[PDB]
Design a binder for this molecule. Structure first.
Ligand SMILES: Cc1cc2nc3c(=O)[nH]c(=O)nc-3n(C[C@H](O)[C@H](O)[C@H](O)COP(=O)(O)OP(=O)(O)OC[C@H]3O[C@@H](n4cnc5c(N)ncnc54)[C@H](O)[C@@H]3O)c2cc1C
Ligand SMILES: O=CCCc1cc(F)cc(F)c1OCc1ccccc1
Length: 647
């Protein structure tokens, strides 16, 4: 349906109130059911008006004018619902044409640290709400971990590049607003072994299905058998995977043992039977000779010796009847051995590609992921196919930056917060002698988790952050993932596949250049460096790592088919001082709850909150994504306005 679709697109149940709405509308939840349904229709229709045209501000008046009778008669309730949706960034978010120009006198000063998607999303909200907002950004550009390389006709994303399903995804709104060219990813992904040979289809399917089985077994271990703690330590996904593989190997060795036992027993029966048949020949050879050694006692002696001879001969033919039914049982047993091994050496390498793919998705070696919680956010996945941004994902933060007071090359060094306000201290990255002091009423920190983890600290908080916050910072995972960009003047790969895989020769290096992406107008290939390889490869110069790419590609397509690239770029996110990694993951011994702790604002001791937090590491249901960063900025903007302008 139409207004039901609007609730779904806003990640809301179309036919009941959320807890958040119950808090804000307690008179509605406690009142008659009929009025609750009116509430839900006003809410849903208001979201639909916005989602149907997110390029213009949806005002209260225009909401009222487009509601049909009887709904356009309860002016007060319509206003209450519009205001709530607006305050929480469910309408009039992103970048859109303002109908009401900005209030000329501001109310409250907010310093936002970092001009990534989360800081930008919050900044636009707070500016719309009539506050004085300034973003301090250490880089010479906005976007943070959205970072697009552009040169000539080449476009390639070094950070985020994939939009997950559009159903429920706020990026569907921003896409319309910014005019992103999205293109669905084709799922075919042929694999090539380290020698460049294609993986045959049957081995590809067999190994993939085994990967799915192994992973489902860890989830059974975790969520049915509750094997999540061992020797007082949290079990990791990698650890659980090693256990389920050990049991598969045990199973192979057992069935092998059973099979050898069947062989041996059959051999022993034949050995015994032949020995018995041997003695029966000796017994018949002795009688057959006493049949030639030969009257009335003689005419009856032949009858008796022929009766005796041919009975042993019937005994012997019957034993040769069992002899065949045994050595034919032996013959098919030797021809039907069970498997020698669980995984052939090549099978294992292929299985390690699927593990590498998973270390890509989580940005970290599997031995670091929480067995119990590594996929705690699964239930919030959007619907629809995934897409890539053909024109470069930087179009989003560049569009969101329009009209904001953004200070580039301005690196925050110290954040001071008291019950009387805040001071942010920063230095000019092009001239670190120049120092700046920003006074404000509230600080919104969107620093990446990697920066918050840095010891000694990059940014100093005065007073120091509370232990409950720093230990959550310490527990949470912050992974790494890198990309080699190869720009050619000609397409030598299969233009109709967006993905192909390189199967590494060893487990430890399985994430090295394991996945290639064909996404762009110009002849560009992105290769991923995942897992353990991601951090280690940053120590390799561009030319050497490009050379290793070219060797892989020369193996797949032929040495003469691969020309030298015209431009190359290599990300080093861990070594990047303004990121120190790629994105959070649920580390063994962490949980979704640490994401809630990260989102919690700080209040100076006895008072009102001063220091606020946004960023991909602060949103439990959508971590490590652009949409989660965006949602987190909208959330903190609502919280800050509630504090400084009233709920
Ligand atoms: C390699 C890679 C691949 C990814 N794959 C995807 C994908 O395809 N799709 C997806 O949805 N997500 C993906 N992600 C994740 C997504 O890009 C991030 O989750 C999101 O961009 C983070 O936004 P943020 O605002 O939380 O942080 P950021 O974008 O990092 O914003 C923080 C900002 O603070 C700035 N800053 C740092 N230190 C200071 C300081 N001292 N003073 C001032 N400013 C400072 C930084 O420069 C930055 O601009 C990927 C990320 C990477 C790096
Ligand atoms: O390039 C960036 C990938 C990072 C990433 C981190 C997430 F936490 C969730 C994502 F959706 C995601 O991006 C697309 C993706 C989806 C599934 C598996 C792998 C990647």
């Amino acid at each position: 349906s139409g207004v039901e679709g609007a609730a779904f697109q806003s990640r809301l149940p179309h036919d009941r109130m959320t807890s958040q709405e119950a808090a804000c509308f307690p008179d509605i939840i406690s009142g008659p059911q009929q009025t609750q349904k009116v509430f839900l229709f006003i809410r849903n229709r208001t979201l639909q008006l916005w989602l149907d045209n997110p390029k213009i501000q949806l005002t209260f008046e225009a909401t009222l004018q487009q509601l049909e009778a009887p709904y356009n008669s309860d002016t007060v309730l319509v206003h209450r619902v519009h205001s709530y949706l607006e305050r929480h960034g469910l309408i009039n978010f992103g970048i859109y044409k303002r109908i009401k120009p900005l209030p000329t006198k501001k109310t409250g000063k907010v310093i936002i640290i970092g001009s990534g998607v989360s800081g930008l999303a919050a900044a636009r909200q707070l500016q719309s709400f009539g506050m004085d907002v300034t973003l301090l950004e250490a880089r010479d550009r906005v976007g943070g971990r959205v970072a697009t390389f552009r040169k000539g006709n080449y476009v390639a994303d070094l950070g985020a590049m994939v939009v997950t399903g559009l159903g429920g995804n706020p990026m569907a709104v921003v896409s319309k607003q910014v005019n992103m060219e999205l293109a669905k990813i084709k799922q075919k992904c042929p694999l090539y072994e380290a020698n460049g040979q294609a993986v045959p289809k049957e081995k590809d399917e067999m190994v993939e299905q085994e990967f799915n089985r192994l992973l489902e077994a860890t989830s059974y271990l975790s969520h049915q058998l509750d094997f999540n703690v061992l020797n007082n330590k949290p079990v990791s996904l990698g650890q659980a995977l090693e256990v389920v593989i050990q049991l598969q190997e045990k199973h192979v060795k057992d069935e092998q043992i059973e099979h050898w036992k069947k062989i041996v027993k059959t051999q022993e029966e034949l050995k015994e039977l032949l020995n018995k048949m041997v003695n029966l020949k000796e017994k018949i050879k002795e009688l057959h000779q006493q049949y030639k050694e030969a009257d009335i006692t003689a005419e009856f002696l032949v009858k008796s010796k022929h009766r005796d001879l041919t009975a042993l001969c019937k005994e012997y033919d019957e034993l040769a009847e069992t002899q065949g039914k045994l050595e034919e049982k032996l013959q098919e047993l030797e021809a039907n051995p069970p498997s020698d091994v669980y995984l052939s050496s090549r099978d294992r390498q292929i299985l390690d590609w699927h593990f590498a793919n998973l270390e890509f998705a989580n940005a970290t070696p599997l031995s670091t992921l929480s067995l119990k919680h590594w996929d705690q956010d699964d239930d919030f996945e959007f619907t629809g196919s995934h897409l890539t941004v053909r024109n470069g994902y930087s179009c989003v933060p560049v569009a969101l930056a329009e009209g904001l007071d953004i200070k580039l090359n301005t690196a925050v060094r110290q954040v001071r917060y008291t019950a009387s306000g805040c001071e942010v201290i920063a230095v000019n990255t092009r001239s670190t002698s120049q120092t700046f002091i920003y006074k404000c009423d509230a600080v919104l920190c969107t620093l990446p988790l990697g920066v918050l983890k840095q010891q000694p600290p990059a940014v100093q908080f005065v007073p120091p952050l509370p232990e409950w916050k720093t230990s959550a910072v310490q527990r949470m995972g912050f992974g790494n993932l890198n990309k080699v960009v190869l720009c050619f003047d000609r397409v030598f790969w299969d233009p109709s596949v967006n993905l192909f895989g390189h199967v590494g020769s060893t487990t430890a290096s399985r994430g090295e250049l394991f996945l290639f992406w064909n996404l762009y107008k110009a002849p560009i290939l992105l290769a991923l460096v995942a897992g353990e390889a991601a951090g280690i490869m940053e120590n390799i110069s561009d030319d050497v790592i490009v050379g290793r790419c070219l060797a892989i590609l020369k193996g797949i397509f032929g040495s003469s088919a691969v020309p030298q690239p015209k431009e190359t770029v290599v990300s080093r996110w861990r070594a990047d001082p303004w990121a120190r990694g790629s994105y959070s993951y649920v580390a063994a011994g962490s949980s979704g709850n640490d994401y809630d702790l990260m989102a919690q604002p700080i209040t100076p001791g006895p008072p009102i909150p001063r220091l606020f937090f946004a960023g991909e590491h602060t949103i439990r249901n959508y971590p490590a994504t652009v949409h989660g960063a965006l949602l987190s900025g909208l959330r903190e903007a609502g919280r800050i306005a509630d504090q400084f302008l009233g709920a």
